[PDB]
Amino acid sequence: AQNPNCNIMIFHPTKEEFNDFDKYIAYMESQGAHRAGLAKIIPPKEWKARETYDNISEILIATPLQQVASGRAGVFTQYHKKKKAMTVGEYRHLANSKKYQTPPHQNFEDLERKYWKNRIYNSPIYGADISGSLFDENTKQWNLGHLGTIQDLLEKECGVVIEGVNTPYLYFGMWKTTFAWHTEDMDLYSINYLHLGEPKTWYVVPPEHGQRLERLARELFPGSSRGCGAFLRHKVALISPTVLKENGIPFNRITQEAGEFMVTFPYGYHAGFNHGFNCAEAINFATPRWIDYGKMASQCSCGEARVTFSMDAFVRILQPERYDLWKRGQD
Numbered sequence: 001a002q003n004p005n006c007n008i009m010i011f012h013p014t015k016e017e018f019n020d021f022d023k024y025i026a027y028m029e030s031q032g033a034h035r036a037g038l039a040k041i042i043p044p045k046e047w048k049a050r051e052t053y054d055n056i057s058e059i060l061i062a063t064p065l066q067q068v069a070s071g072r073a074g075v076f077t078q079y080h081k082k083k084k085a086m087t088v089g090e091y092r093h094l095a096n097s098k099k100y101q102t103p104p105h106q107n108f109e110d111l112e113r114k115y116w117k118n119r120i121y122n123s124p125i126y127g128a129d130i131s132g133s134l135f136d137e138n139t140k141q142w143n144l145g146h147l148g149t150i151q152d153l154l155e156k157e158c159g160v161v162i163e164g165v166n167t168p169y170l171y172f173g174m175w176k177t178t179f180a181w182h183t184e185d186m187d188l189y190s191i192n193y194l195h196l197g198e199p200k201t202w203y204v205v206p207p208e209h210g211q212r213l214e215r216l217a218r219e220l221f222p223g224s225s226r227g228c229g230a231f232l233r234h235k236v237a238l239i240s241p242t243v244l245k246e247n248g249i250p251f252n253r254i255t256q257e258a259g260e261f262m263v264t265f266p267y268g269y270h271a272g273f274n275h276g277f278n279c280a281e282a283i284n285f286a287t288p289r290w291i292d293y294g295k296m297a298s299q300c301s302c303g304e305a306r307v308t309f310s311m312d313a314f315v316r317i318l319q320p321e322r323y324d325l326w327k328r329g330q331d
């Protein structure tokens with residue numbers, strides 16, 4: 001078996017290999033990339049997402065989210081407090097202010113130490129889940145707004161047409177902005193392009209060891225676990241690498257820089273933080289290999305998680321038994 005230690009693999013496709021997205025994902029998995037839960041794809045030098053980022057300041061962040069932490073340095077939850085709308089221009093200025101700016105540091109490792117030491121004592125503001133795209137319409141390769149839809153994949157594989165659409169989201173980040181431990185909705189894949197700015201550091205657990213993370217999570221967030229059998233679907237729980245090591249949870253870490261893609265694989269738990277002002281674009285996608293993961297995916301039915309319109313159909317077709325109880329959590 002390829003990549004038996006579940007290392008995060010880095011790919012350097014040629015511009016020829018960059019034409020066919022599906023085929024390259026399949027290629028990565030033939031080399032065992034999926035065993036890590038996460039991969040890095042460096043685009044060919046010929047490729048550009050768009051000409052410049054000089055004209056993005058007028059994008060509105062309708063609902064910036066202030067990420068307030070509770071708990072201990074290495075084991076904490078976060079909640080999102082809604083703040084007033086601001087433009088990307090205003091957000092960038094806020095990100096660079098003394099209160100919110102990245103501190104002096106030697107290297108990514110030093111910044112990572114500072115993140116886990118001090119994250120809980122601040123509440124950075126995140127522009128997350130903003131519907132939209134920064135890919136030029138003429139960017140033909142790996143354009144996150146032009147991927148085959150999950151609905152079309154489900155139909156190709158299972159013979160059934162379903163409602164739903166699948167569009168990208170933009171994330172404007174600053175120092176310490178944080179994404180909690182999670183898999184994707186319906187344990188889908190995700191792909192994330194870091195368009196501009198400062199890096200994003202990621203942690204990931206191999207899909208074959210996901211349940212180990214879940215078991216640790218139930219022990220570390222015992223109240224949350226009693227409230228919901230899939231409370232990580234709430235995307236609020238953080239566990240540091242030091243704590244994962246102490247508990248023998250297998251994982252890996254890697255820093256994504258501007259101009260690089262990351263792909264998360266089905267049931268690959270991940271979490272991470274941003275190093276300073278940045279902009280990423282992301283979207284879920286599916287392959288034939290996803291179907292079995294979709295069929296087995298845990299669901300939140302306590303009602304916290306509350307998800308996209310499009311997910312109804314996935315649960316309805318793939319998890320008909322769960323569909324009655326799940327949709328009650330949606331309404």
Ligand SMILES: O=C(O)CNC(=O)C(=O)O
Nearest residue numbers: 171179190192264280282
């Ligand atoms: O960029 C972020 O904050 C979160 N992104 C993801 O979890 C993803 O792309 O799968």
Ligand SMILES: [Mg+2]
Nearest residue numbers: 055056057058
């Ligand atoms: Mg603009």
Ligand code: NI
Nearest residue numbers: 183184190264
């Ligand atoms: Ni994700």
Ligand SMILES: [Zn+2]
Nearest residue numbers: 228300302304
């Ligand atoms: Zn729940």
